[PDB]
Design a protein around this ligand. Structure first.
Ligand SMILES: [Mg+2]
Ligand SMILES: [Zn+2]
Ligand SMILES: [Zn+2]
Lengths: 1202, 69, 98, 62
């Protein structure tokens, strides 16, 4: 229907064209008949009838008189919904300035008329005159005259000039402006001005003037002479129970405006002193600004409830505004909500749904099927049949939901796994039954959690749920590619208990034909689950090339391991099961099954694994008791020793040998050491036992303690938890950060007294409050990240570029932080991977690195490679499939139309809550910084070189001595300037000292061309470089944190990308969170989209203009095709917020934040939104240009091009 | 849906073609090329795509033949 | 709580909120983000238009379900028209082009 | 210096001194003098007196 949206100033003619009449009275309704009053705020003659196809008289009342005007009323006989569309207008007695174009800094009126804002307010507030027409007089336009001064120059000239007051004077000044002549004057001054600040002033004013000239808008339209009036149904006055009425504040504001306007007309008719007219005009201006934006101009008007009235701007802006409460988020039909229980009998694609809830949700479908099969003649018969709850109604409901997927959601929805499609199974009850294996995806536990359910209606939605949203499809984490349906808690405990090993168990040493005989022996009580036996195992290997090789052989194992092998699918080695199985082992099993067998086998294997784990956890009988918290006997003696030597050191302190701070520090150190030793002793005591084998010798065996098993299996609990249960709680902190000298020496088994519990609460309250605030901080960060990268959609397949990023293993000392396989898995190479020391091509170009090629790279010991990356992609809009690589949640190459930006933002934002020289290797030494490389050629040590046993190329042996988390992420993504940034080298030249000016110091640099540049360095700066030294561009002058803008400006795009990626991955890796770096690269690409045009060329671009990058790239391509002067640019780095507010579409920017500023800018400029991104299409109800709708939008630009 | 997306190549195109086939079988008078086995039209269309009977080119050819007649 | 079709708001023409009002669950911003990440464009369009504030669309959708057609003719959400009216009321001309 | 219109209004009205009884009589005399001059100016019109005369003719007839 429509293809674009414009915005711009509204002329009085346009407002009159919108209006269906003029509101002349503040009347709303009659107090007796409750009917609309004529020429009022709710007039039926202006806005339409109150009843459908009726008029206020009652003479024309049926549909026969549609479209006729009641000659004695004027009410058009039509539908009442026209009262939601028909607008009115008020003819203001005096012009009123628009509040948005006056007080939203920068003031458009202010810099169009090149005079300060306070001057304009003084004129508007009726305090100072302005000369509009100077005539044959020395006065100049815009010069202010006081009242007495005004009479002086009136009596000394007369009618030769004109001086006025108020918004009328501003309108006269703005209407007489000759915009082209002003523009020419600004350009001429711009060329001939030598001050850059003045240049910024003039370029702003010239941009605004040229925007006015090109958009066709006129400046005088910023002053309102006709005020539009909203339709009554959007500002309702409706009755409540008991005769009370509910109204909107817009009614009060409009009534105030109308009353003051009518009083102004009355005062202009009955000739009044100028003071009264001036006061009335002030009131009119104040009322209009309050209606448009309450509280901006001054004190906000309050209603009868003593709270500020909320205006149109408040109704379009804010968290509770129309954009965010009703457009980007809505309440929907065919939805339900219930508490969630656990269904251990369900499959991965099934969810338990209550019968009553499904009956309510699927009511129209039941009606349709009852009508189709003939059990109901009409729809009311079906309604009563459903309400009476017959049996055939239940059969119809069974057949309706037979293959109708349903969407389950849990709030908050941090990532896309928070909503999934399941097949419903009707259960008698009131709670939704959820499969355990999906709980980790929902972050759901059964302590009172509630989930929402939604019913897709059309066939497209059902197939999207079945293909994309089905729980069986989403079993890989899109953030890292690891499985998300890994078992936890009782499944892990059962698989651990079944796979443990015991000495001298019943049936030890027996020979078994296979897993079936092991199960038979277990069921007959011949052998225990932990008996060490020999089993004949037939094992099939599927190789990388697909070869299927089966080998049968005798393996030493346990009974439980064979019974678990009974369910393992063919194609996996037995070594994956011939061990005790913790959480990591089961995760490895699932990963291997996915990598070598596929998806269906993985789902079946996971279901069988969780069945078996639950069954044998139930059969184990694992229980927690007070005797399982064994407290080592060494704890009491060690506490006694620590206390005695505390007494000794306190006595020594009384002798004055050491100070108080030293005593505090060493007491803390001894208490930390005592805690560590007590924890170690408790772990050693708890982790082992002594048994008797078949020979009678005492043997050392792993303990079967319940808490030890829980902690070691990874089901729940860690070493620290056991330490507080059975050892020492340790040192706790005073709530300002300081650590109390005395620690807690009692665990939870023995119990604490009053002060120990008080110190515990000190930290408990802080932890709770920190979680509460950090959740909101992470939510705001993820909102910003979603909005900055919402436009990124895979639009092509190959972008035809040669650029790429060079990747190496990360080294932060003498050990690796991440292997090259982890970083290179799922990417596409840019240039051919040549084998080191050889010219052969091991890996060709444009090939995806899967596990096989990763193992190849690991075998051939490649240190550095280079692959395609999103930021280096040169697609005009979005990115291409090759530059993005593998889709982590799917395992293959990313499909066209994938919203990679939203996935990236969710992946980064989801773990926000979890947030807060001796050589060691044998090899050679290389200098660049110091590098130590093994004989294979992999650089495995990177060390700093402050300004050495071995020189360059000298071999070094082992042991030779050559010699705050989430705020940090937010600051990195906002590109915040450090408080004390490191000063960098602007250009490669020789350093020299300069004149030490008072206050702060100056330095000079001499370039290769002999030009000298002066740098302004503060006094309190540690200066590193020395005079006469040629420092390269980007060298550190003063140490400190590096600003991202500086490294982008001086070093390059790859440098800033690497910096941001490394910092973000460091903060996410300290907490042990796995996030792929392509998401960060997408965010960085969205951070690099603008450019300051330096060399203007001739493509219409002012110097110093912040244009957007791909427009320049396209324009440069056309210019090259024309062989005519191209343009040169410098790329800027903008934070996610600033980049979001700087996007081309004004709808998305308005919906994000700062709606008033964005709307004012767009309206003055006359912007045009073409609806290319996700958010605008979401707001206007159209299909998003991503995923299933992508092709549809493509067809649109197939039509617009033709 | 692994077989269907393997035969078609793209999940989104698979969804669109299956939706077209399901609407043909439901709104129109077209009959299934495979035994229904008491299945909804979406599942029948997915099974048809899995068996390789139905693709975008086949649907376009059938639509062209219907338009000709 | 479960709702197929019930009461609607006076101004936004959207389903009410709460069990007491027999309202509907809220599909917030993050749910839309998840649907966009999946790529389910048609499901998102269903939630935005024919389930919340497209009056003619939702009526015809109910009729189609009763007639066993399971297809939708999406229209313009009423909230967008309300927003256009508000922006027009602020003396700002916002319009649609063909 | 201020944004509340009330304070500006009081500033503007506070610049004129308060009147006394004699000032009130003087202003009332000026108003009456102006009204008398207007009445005298209108009375010098051939069409004014006939209107008053015919109005009195209709009034006296009850
Ligand atoms: Mg919970
Ligand atoms: Zn009438
Ligand atoms: Zn590319």
């Amino acid at each position: 229907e429509f293809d674009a949206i414009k915005i711009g100033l509204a002329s009085p003619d346009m407002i009159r064209s919108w209006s269906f009449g003029e509101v002349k009275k503040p009347e709303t309704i009659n107090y007796r008949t409750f009917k609309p009053e004529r020429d009022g705020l709710f007039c039926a003659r202006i806005f339409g009838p109150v009843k459908d196809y009726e008029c206020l008289c009652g003479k024309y009342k049926r549909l026969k008189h549609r479209g006729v005007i009641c000659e004695k009323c004027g009410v058009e006989v039509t539908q009442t919904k026209v009262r939601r569309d028909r607008m009115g207008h008020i003819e203001l007695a005096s012009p009123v300035a628009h509040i948005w174009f006056l007080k939203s800094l920068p003031s458009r009126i202010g810099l169009l008329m090149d005079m300060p804002l306070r001057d304009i307010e003084r004129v508007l507030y009726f305090e100072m005159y302005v000369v509009t027409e100077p005539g044959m007089t020395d006065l100049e336009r815009g010069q202010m005259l006081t009242e007495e001064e005004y009479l002086d120059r009136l009596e000394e000239w007369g009618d030769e000039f004109t001086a006025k007051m108020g918004a009328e004077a501003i309108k006269d000044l703005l209407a007489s402006m000759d915009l082209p002549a002003e523009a020419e004057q600004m350009r001429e001054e711009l060329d001939t001005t030598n001050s850059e600040t003045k240049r910024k002033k003039l370029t702003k004013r010239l941009k605004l003037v040229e925007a006015f000239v090109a958009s066709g808008n006129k400046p005088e339209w910023m002053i309102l002479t006709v005020l539009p009036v909203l339709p009554p149904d959007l500002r309702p006055l409706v009755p409540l129970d008991g005769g009370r009425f509910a109204t909107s504040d817009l009614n009060d504001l409009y009534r105030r405006v109308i009353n003051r306007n009518n009083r102004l007309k009355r005062l202009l008719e009955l000739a009044a002193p100028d003071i009264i007219v001036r006061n009335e005009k002030r009131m009119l201006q104040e009322s209009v600004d309050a209606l448009l934006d309450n509280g901006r101009r001054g004190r906000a008007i309050t209603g009868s409830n003593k709270r500020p009235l909320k205006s149109l701007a408040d109704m379009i802006k804010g968290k509770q505004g129309r954009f965010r409460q009703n457009l980007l988020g809505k309440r929907v039909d065919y939805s339900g909500r219930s508490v969630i229980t656990v269904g251990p009998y369900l499959r991965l694609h099934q969810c338990g749904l209550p019968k009553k809830m499904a009956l309510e949700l699927f009511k129209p479908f039941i009606y349709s099927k009852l009508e189709t099969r003939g059990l109901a003649t009409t729809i009311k018969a079906a309604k009563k049949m459903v309400e009476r709850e017959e049996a055939v109604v239940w059969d119809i409901l069974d057949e309706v939901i037979r293959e109708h997927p349903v969407l389950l959601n849990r709030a908050p929805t941090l990532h896309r796994l928070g909503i999934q499609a399941f097949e419903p199974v009707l259960i008698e009850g009131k709670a939704i039954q959820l499969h355990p294996l999906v709980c980790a995806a929902y972050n759901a536990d059964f302590d009172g959690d509630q989930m929402a359910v939604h019913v897709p209606l059309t066939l497209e939605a059902q197939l999207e749920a079945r293909t994309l949203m089905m729980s069986t499809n989403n079993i890989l984490s899109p953030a890292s590619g690891d499985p998300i349906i890994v078992p936890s808690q009782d499944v892990v405990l059962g698989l651990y208990y079944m796979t443990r090993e015991k000495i001298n168990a019943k049936g030890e040493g027996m020979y078994l034909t296979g897993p079936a005989e092991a199960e038979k022996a277990y069921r007959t009580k011949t052998a225990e689950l932990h008996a060490r036996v020999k089993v004949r195992i037939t094992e099939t290997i599927k190789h990388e090339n697909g070869k299927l090789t089966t080998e049968t052989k005798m393996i030493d194992t346990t009974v439980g391991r064979a019974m678990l092998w009974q369910i393992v699918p063919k194609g996996l080695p037995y070594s994956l099961v011939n061990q005790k199985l913790g959480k990591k082992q089961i995760s490895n099993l699932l990963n291997e099954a996915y990598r070598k067998l596929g998806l269906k086998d993985t789902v079946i294997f996971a279901d069988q694994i969780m069945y078996t784990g639950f069954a044998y956890a139930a059969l184990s009988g694992v229980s927690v008791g007070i005797d399982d918290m064994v407290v080592p006997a060494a704890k009491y003696t060690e506490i006694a020793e620590a206390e005695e030597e505390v007494r000794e050191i306190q006595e020594q302190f009384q002798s004055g040998l050491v100070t108080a701070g030293e005593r505090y520090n060493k007491v803390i150190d001894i208490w930390a050491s005592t805690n560590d030793r007590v924890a170690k002793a408790m772990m050693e005591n708890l982790s082992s036992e002594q048994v008797i084998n078949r020979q009678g010798e005492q043997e050392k065996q792993e303990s079967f303690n319940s808490i030890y098993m829980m902690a070691d299996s990874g089901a729940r609990g860690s070493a620290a938890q056991i330490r507080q249960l059975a050892g020492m709680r340790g040192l706790m902190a005073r709530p300002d950060g300081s650590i109390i000298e005395t620690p807690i020496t009692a665990n939870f088994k023995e119990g604490l007294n009053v002060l120990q519990y008080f110190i515990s609460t000190h930290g408990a309250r802080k932890g709770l409050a920190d979680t509460a605030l950090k959740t909101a901080n992470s939510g705001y960060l993820t909102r910003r990240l979603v909005d900055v990268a919402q436009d990124v959609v895979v639009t092509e397949h190959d972008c035809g570029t040669l650029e790429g990023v060079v990747m190496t293993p990360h080294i932060e000392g003498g050990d690796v932080k991440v292997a090259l396989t982890e970083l290179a898995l799922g990417r596409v190479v840019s240039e051919d991977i040549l084998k080191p020391g050889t010219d052969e091509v091991l890996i060709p170009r444009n090939t995806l690195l899967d596990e096989k090629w990763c193992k190849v790279i690991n075998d051939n010991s490649v240190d550095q490679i280079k692959v395609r990356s999103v930021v280096t992609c040169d697609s005009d809009f979005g990115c291409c499939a090759q530059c993005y690589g593998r889709d982590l949640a799917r395992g293959h190459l990313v499909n066209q139309g994938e919203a990679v930006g939203v996935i990236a933002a969710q992946s980064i934002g989801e773990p926000g809550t979890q947030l807060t020289i001796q050589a060691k290797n044998n090899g050679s030494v290389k200098l660049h910084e110091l590098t130590i490389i093994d004989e294979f050629g992999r650089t495995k040590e990177k060390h700093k070189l402050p300004y050495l046993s071995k020189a360059d190329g000298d071999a070094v042996a082992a042991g030779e001595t050559v010699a705050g988390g989430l705020p940090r992420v937010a600051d990195l993504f906002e590109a915040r300037k450090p408080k004390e940034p490191a000063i960098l080298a602007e250009h490669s030249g020789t350093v020299s000292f300069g004149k030490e000016t008072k206050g702060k110091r100056r330095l000079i640099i001499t370039r290769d061309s002999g030009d000298t540049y002066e740098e302004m360095i503060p006094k309190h700066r540690q200066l590193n470089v020395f005079e006469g030294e040629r420092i390269e561009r980007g060298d550190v002058i003063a140490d400190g944190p590096e600003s991202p803008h500086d490294i982008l400006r001086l070093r390059g795009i790859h440098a800033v990308t690497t910096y941001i990626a490394n910092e973000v991955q460091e903060v996410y890796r300290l907490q042990g969170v796995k996030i792929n770096d392509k998401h960060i690269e997408t965010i960085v690409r969205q951070m690099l989209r603008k450019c300051t045009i330096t060399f203007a060329g001739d493509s219409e671009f002012l110097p110093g203009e912040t244009v957007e990058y791909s427009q320049v790239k396209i324009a440069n391509r056309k210019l090259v095709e024309e062989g005519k002067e191209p343009a040169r640019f410098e790329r800027e780095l903008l934070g996610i917020t600033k980049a979001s507010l700087a996007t081309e579409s004004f709808i998305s920017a308005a919906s994000f934040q700062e709606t008033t500023r964005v709307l004012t800018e767009a309206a003055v400029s006359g912007k045009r939104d073409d609806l290319r991104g996700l958010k605008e299409n979401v707001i206007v109800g159209r299909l998003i240009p991503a995923g299933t709708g992508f092709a549809y939008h493509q067809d649109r630009q197939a039509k617009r091009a033709q | 849906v692994q077989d269907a997306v393997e035969k078609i190549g793209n999940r989104f195109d698979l969804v669109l073609v299956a939706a077209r086939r399901a609407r043909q079988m439901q709104s129109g008078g077209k009959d299934a090329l495979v035994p229904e086995e008491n299945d909804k039209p979406t599942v029948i269309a997915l099974r048809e795509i899995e068996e390789g009977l139905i693709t975008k080119d086949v649907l376009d050819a059938r639509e062209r033949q219907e338009q000709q007649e | 709580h479960a709702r197929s079709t019930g009461s609607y708001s006076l101004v936004t023409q959207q389903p009410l909120g709460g069990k007491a009002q027999f309202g509907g669950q809220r599909f917030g911003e993050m749910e839309v983000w998840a649907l966009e990440a999946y790529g389910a464009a048609y499901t998102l369009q269903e939630m935005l238009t024919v389930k919340s504030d497209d009056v003619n669309g939702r009526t015809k959708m109910y009729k189609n379900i009763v007639d066993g057609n399971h297809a939708m003719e999406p229209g313009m959400p009423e909230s967008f028209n309300v927003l256009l009216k508000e922006i027009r009321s602020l003396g700002i001309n916002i319009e649609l082009e063909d | 210096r201020t944004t509340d219109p009330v304070r500006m209004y009081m500033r503007e009205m506070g610049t004129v001194e308060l009147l006394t009884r004699e000032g009130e009589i003087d202003i009332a005399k000026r108003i009456e003098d102006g009204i008398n001059q207007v009445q005298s100016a209108i009375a010098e019109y051939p069409g004014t007196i006939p209107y008053i005369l015919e109005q009195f003719d209709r009034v006296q007839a009850e």
